[PDB]
Design a protein around this ligand. Structure first.
Ligand SMILES: O=C(O)C[C@@H]1CCC[C@H]1C(=O)c1ccccc1
Ligand SMILES: O=C(O)C[C@@H]1CCC[C@H]1C(=O)c1ccccc1
Lengths: 227, 226
């Protein structure tokens, strides 16, 4: 195959979707074929469609979904409220394997935080990562509390020998402050910071977002993701 | 000795302090002697003082602390800004074992979440709990996202063989709402919910707070602690 990254986060609302797009944009400008996969998607009744949002920001055309639930809740709860079921574990692993191919970077965006249940019983994006041999790229905040959440997420990753591809600060304010500045310095000592996307990056149009995305990541690190 | 309990939370602002006080108040009302240790306090410039809140809310007098930093940051950040080290590992551990005594419930309140740095070098409330054989009471929210943070904290607990004494929801909204109602059912499937404190409990006067606290916890569980 190629390279699979799960793109997880320390929680909900931390910037998982916009970072997928940014890494997707950067990887294409590095000449890499990129597929983005969103196995579990909630909040459709509110118009949430993260895959569509990646295409809008990054120009990604290779989008694969699977499960879609109306309520903006945890997948288990959105499914329970719809009278529907969670996908099966192998349904997810298969969705990913069908995208996986040599030379292609396949990003798998989760729902919420790393330990959210995606399939019954208690199957998480961590389990999905073990099954498809993926590494985890962790999206974090710069806000008070992020060091603890980040450290917890990493230890959950090392518990099942799922490699950590690094952190991305989803939203980085300009100028920062003492708490943000301190958290960034501390995040850099726990793990590699691959990017810190400027606040409002989700509101950039196609060309500006691609420029921002190329500047955000180290080109050599992006290029080094796939042989 | 007696019973040492650490009271931690999934993050900052989850209601660790009000939970400490409620459990203190409940246990005192069961005729138990309570001490509360808060080794490190930050945010003192704006008047943060969680031991005082526990004294006021619960009437605890054995209130033990070692360090106070002005900045409203994480202890290591507050320390760095002030130009002075954190306390040492031994200082925190020996303070707690000196508080510990037969018949007494000794609560240990951290700063922020479980993995926050509390003492020199990089020692956490989780390390402290191991060193003193304390179980952990985990304060959680009812908001979207609480399940992940909670499972993350319980797995961090288990990874170092620290018992989980249960979860407390720091702030229960009224009326609950769909997300909070669903999270409570799930949280109770992941661990024993010991109490859910009504939102705003932190502002009650002492009479009402003790009454709140007595009814918030199961009386038999509280008693069975010491
Ligand atoms: O992807 C996100 O985090 C945004 C979703 C927006 C609505 C729900 C949120 C979600 O996927 C989720 C999953 C488990 C627990 C809490 C939230
Ligand atoms: O106990 C709290 O969470 C309130 C404190 C109010 C000021 C800081 C906060 C704190 O103790 C803390 C510790 C580590 C990381 C983030 C915040």
């Amino acid at each position: 195959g190629g390279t699979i990254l799960v793109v997880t986060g320390t929680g909900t609302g931390v910037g998982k979707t916009v970072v997928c797009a940014a890494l997707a944009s950067a990887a294409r400008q590095a000449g890499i074929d990129v597929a983005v996969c969103k196995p579990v998607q909630t909040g459709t009744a509110r118009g949430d469609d993260d895959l569509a949002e990646v295409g809008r920001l990054a120009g990604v055309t290779q989008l694969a979904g699977l499960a879609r639930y109306p309520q903006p809740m945890a997948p288990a709860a959105a499914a329970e409220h719809a009278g529907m079921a969670l996908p099966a574990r192998d349904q997810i692993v298969r969705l990913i394997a069908d995208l996986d191919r040599p030379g292609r970077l396949t990003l798998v965006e989760g729902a919420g935080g790393l330990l959210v249940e995606l399939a019954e019983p208690g199957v998480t994006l961590r389990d999905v990562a073990v099954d498809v041999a993926a590494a985890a790229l962790v999206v974090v905040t710069a806000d008070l509390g992020t060091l603890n959440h980040t450290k917890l997420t990493l230890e959950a990753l090392a518990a099942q020998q799922v490699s950590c591809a690094g952190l991305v600060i989803g939203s980085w304010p300009d100028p920062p402050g003492l708490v943000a500045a301190s958290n960034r310095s501390a995040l850099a000592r726990i793990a590699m910071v691959r990017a810190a996307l400027p606040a409002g990056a989700a509101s950039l149009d196609a060309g500006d977002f691609a420029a921002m995305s190329a500047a955000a990541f180290d080109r050599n690190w992006v290029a080094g993701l796939v042989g």
